[PDB]
């Protein structure tokens, strides 16, 4: 319908991985994709809290969990603790409407109701026990492979890649 298109150019280790391409649900989650969509291109300027960039740009998928999921968008500490949204800290949960049906489906990372920031993790498998829960507001439409690639690479005890899997250039499509 109102849908929008939005991309990931990712590197690991600084070689080129690919281009993950997003459809998003505007439809179904305003909110929660008019943050994801300024996230990408950094059209909403500094975080209200933390004084950062609403951006992309440069952060990694510091989380990846081998058969589920990987993990980005904490451009503030890069670990899983920060991240912000474009309307002031954290935002409530929109919608449960989108549901972890299908893999690759794009949902938002939380630590508790109504805690959205900019976090979010792309899933592999359908995960329903996830429903209630995250907020499912996209679809991978195009580059899975790049988002298994990066979800099967080693990691630490801490689930951390030991590549360094970053977010090259982000923005919007179609």
């Known amino acids: 319908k109102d849908r929008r298109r939005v991309f990931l150019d990712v590197t690991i280790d600084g070689n080129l991985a690919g281009r993950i391409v997003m459809e998003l649900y505007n439809d179904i989650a305003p909110r929660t994709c ?11 300027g500094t975080g209200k809290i933390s004084g950062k ?32 949204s474009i309307y002031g800290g954290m935002f409530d949960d929109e919608e449960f409407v989108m549901k972890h049906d299908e893999p690759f489906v794009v949902s938002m990372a939380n630590k508790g109701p109504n805690t ?3 976090q979010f993790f792309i899933t592999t498998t359908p995960a329903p026990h996830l429903n209630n829960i995250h907020v499912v507001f996209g679809k991978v439409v195009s580059g899975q492979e790049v ?6 690479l080693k990691t630490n005890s ?17």
């Open 34 to 44: 008019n943050n994801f969509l300024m996230l990408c291109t950094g059209m909403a």
């Open 116 to 118: 959205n920031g900019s």
């Open 158 to 174: 801490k689930n951390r890649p030991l590549a360094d899997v970053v977010i090259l250039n982000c923005g919007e499509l179609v």
């Open 53 to 84: 960039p609403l951006h992309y740009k440069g952060s990694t998928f510091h989380r990846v969990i081998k058969n589920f999921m990987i993990q980005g968008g904490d451009f503030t500490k890069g670990d899983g603790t920060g991240g912000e």
């Open 147 to 152: 988002v298994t690639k990066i979800e099967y």
